[PDB]
């Protein structure tokens, strides 16, 4: 995996459903997935009901997180303390 953590990061979340997202900057979630809430490049980009988060696997790709970034429905996931 990576070595350093993502800056701005907030916390980790867990999906509760399987939502296949196929976009140029989407975030695929699978019922029981792990995602990290990170601060997007702007609130104007943030979608209504969806926020900018990264999957655990993407974390390992922190090297290219800029290309691992995506959007996911928060109302479809769960926050992890």
């Amino acid at each position: 995996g990576r070595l350093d953590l993502p800056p701005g990061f907030m916390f980790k979340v867990q999906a509760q459903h399987d939502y296949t997202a196929t976009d140029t900057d989407e975030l695929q979630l699978k019922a029981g997935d792990v995602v990290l809430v990170i601060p997007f490049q702007n609130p104007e980009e943030q979608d209504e009901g969806w926020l900018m988060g990264v999957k655990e696997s993407d974390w390992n790709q922190h090297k290219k997180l800029e290309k691992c970034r995506g959007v996911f429905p928060e109302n479809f996931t769960e926050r992890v303390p």
């Binding site: 939502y19 976009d23 900057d25 997007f40 979608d47 959007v71 429905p73």
Partner: peptide, 14 residues
């Protein structure tokens, strides 16, 4: 029973 949200736009991060 989490209700699935509506289709979101192409959120191109940069």
């Amino acid at each position: 029973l989490l209700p699935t949200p509506p289709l979101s736009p192409s959120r191109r991060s940069g």
